[PDB]
Amino acid sequence: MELWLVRHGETLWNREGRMLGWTDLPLTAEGEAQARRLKGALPSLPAFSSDLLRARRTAELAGFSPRLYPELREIHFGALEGALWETLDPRYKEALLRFQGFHPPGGESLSAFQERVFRFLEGLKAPAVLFTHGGVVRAVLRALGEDGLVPPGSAVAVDWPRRVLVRLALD
Template sequence: MFEIWLVRHGETDWNHAGRLQGWTDIPLNEAGWCQARRLAAALHGVPFCAVYTSDLVRARTTASLLQRELNAPLLVTQQLRERCFGSGEGLTRQEIAERFPNGIPDAEPEAQLSARMADWFRRVLAIHRKGRILAVTHGGFIRQALRMAGVDPPATLANTCVNRFRHTPDGWRALAVNAAEHLAICHPSHAAASHTSRPSAPY
């Protein structure tokens, strides 16, 4: 049996403001650090063969916080990046609709993102075959993975949500979607103490 747990990175100021990030390298904000620490605590004791991460700083920081708790090798890859939104990066959805009514001309095609996602799934399956890995990535990547597993993605994916995929003879099956029980008590005001208690998360 082989499972992939896809985790969305923690919150950034652009997430909070509703701005598309794409490949723009925005760091975690205070809430994002809190979210990552809460998830790290919730995953304590769950064995992982490896922790993979997108090379963008919001994902790498999230992954580093998780890796310290999980004590698994950390591997960085550009394949886990968000979709590139080109000229749309830094804009809100409303601003994009006004400036690019026919779509962002230099954005990464969705089919290209889907192919990148599927190739990464094939690569890690060939490497690991069994066990469990965790990968910190982005909302667009996770949505493509859910569609591959036959699941309609939710309208919103929570920052640091967990999405579990299991490889079966019939392909990939989603066991958990947008799971974020660890965020129930996470708030910027709790960030300083977020690593001191261990929440329960039935992932």
């Protein structure tokens, strides 16, 4: 099933390199610029969005009025929320780099994150645009056997759960 996944526009923690999960940060001015550029570049399909501000605002600026779902949220980093990637203990760094065996104290395990995300995707009855987060887009791309890193304010379309269709980035 055709699904478009949008990584929300940038927040301060992108340039700062801090782990951004459930911390509800707003978009930066450039983040809004990115979100606005998506208007007219995404298909007219039912829209769903993470309920976190940065996602919702991206969907709004993108000319959409999505139905909010917490299931589309970035992974919950727990105690690692706000920590600099640079200072993360190697065990966590490796876990995140290899996308496996990640269980932050007070947070959500990668396994639970994937289950949550994939269960939501399974429930979709028809093509739709999903305003979400880098980790969600990554989980989906990796499951489809490809590198999962995409720029803020960019999107990817996939034929779930079979293959990636296109990656769209704007300048």
